[PDB]
């Protein structure tokens, strides 16, 4: 990630090896993106961990539904309807990992009308502290089958930026 400082890259080497390295299946495409956020990591995590409410920190979502008496645990699902004018209409997604202690979460696409077969994403949230400053870096990686990388990278980048905007609005003193 070309936005991270040398110190940020050094402190994140472990997390990248631990959560963002893939054994690529035949015929795939993977990328890692980073976003610096000037807000406390506990706040950033409280936003991005809400699997049932991706529209609150992502673009392009017309609506997101979950079942009645929804319980956020691995295996739960969400039904996303995409706004018009994109190369996707609907997506059914499954929560793959939720680690509140380590601030790791991830999901997989398991259905829908779109072109991102076998898409799987992992997001991690990281605390930085130096002198009297506390800030966050979010890392998000994906793998997907098979322009494709350009579209998926740009969406992931824009969504990380929305997450940053939301968290920074909430963190204002």
Ligand X SMILES: Cc1ccc(CS(=O)(=O)Nc2ccc(C#N)c(C3CC3)c2)cc1
Q: Which residues are documented as binding site? A: 58, 88-93, 115-121, 140
Is the Cβ of residue 101 or residue 129 nearer to a copy of itself in the bound state?
A: 129
**Which option in ligand X, a copy of itself, none does residue 133 bind, with CB closer than 5 to 8 A by kind?**
a copy of itself
8 Å CB contact between 107 and 93: yes
Q: Is 172 in the site for a copy of itself (CB under 8 A)?
A: yes
What minimum distance in Å lies between the beta carbon of 159 and a copy of itself?
13
Q: Is 173 in the site for a copy of itself (CB under 8 A)?
A: yes
What minimum distance in Å lies between the beta carbon of 46 and ligand X?
18
Q: Is 129 in the site for a copy of itself (CB under 8 A)?
A: no
**DSSP states along 4-66:** S-HHHHHHHHHHHHHHS---PPSSEEEEEEEEEESS-HHHHHHHHT-TT-GGGT-SSEEEEE-
**Which option in a copy of itself, ligand X, none does residue 172 bind, with CB closer than 5 to 8 A by kind?**
a copy of itself
- Which of these, 141, 130, 138, lies nearest to 32 by C-alpha position? 141
Q: Catalog residues that contact ligand X under the rule CB under 6 A.
A: 54, 58, 60-61, 80, 82, 86-88, 91, 109, 114-116, 119, 152, 155-156
Q: Is 133 in the site for a copy of itself (CB under 8 A)?
A: yes
Residues 6+ apart with CB under 8 A from 123: 48, 104, 105, 106, 138, 139, 140
Q: Is 73 in the site for a copy of itself (CB under 8 A)?
A: no
Q: What is the dihedral of CA 101, 51, 1, 134, to 10 degrees?
A: -50
- Which of these, 44, 59, 22, 43, lies nearest to 144 by C-alpha position? 22
What minimum distance in Å lies between the beta carbon of 5 and a copy of itself?
5
How many angstroms separate the CA atoms of 43 and 138, rounded?
12
Interacting residue ranges for a copy of itself, rule: CB under 8 A? 3, 5-7, 38, 130-133, 161, 165, 168, 172-173
């Amino acid at each position: 990630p070309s936005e991270l400082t040398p110190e940020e890259r050094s402190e994140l080497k472990n997390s990248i090896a631990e959560f963002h390295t893939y054994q690529l299946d035949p015929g795939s495409c993977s990328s890692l993106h980073a976003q610096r956020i000037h807000a406390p990591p506990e706040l950033v995590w409280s936003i991005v961990r809400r699997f049932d409410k991706p529209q609150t920190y992502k673009h392009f979502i017309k609506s997101c539904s979950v079942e009645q008496n929804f319980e956020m645990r691995v295996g739960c699902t969400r039904d996303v309807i995409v706004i018009s004018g994109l190369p996707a209409n609907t997506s059914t997604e499954r929560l793959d990992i939720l680690d509140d202690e380590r601030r790791v979460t991830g999901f997989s696409i398991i259905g829908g009308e779109h072109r991102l077969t076998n898409y799987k994403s992992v997001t991690t949230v990281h605390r930085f502290e130096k002198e009297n400053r506390i800030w966050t870096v979010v890392l998000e990686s994906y793998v997907v089958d098979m322009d494709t990388r350009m579209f998926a990278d740009t969406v992931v980048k824009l969504n990380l930026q929305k997450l940053a905007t939301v968290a920074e609005a909430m963190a204002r003193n």
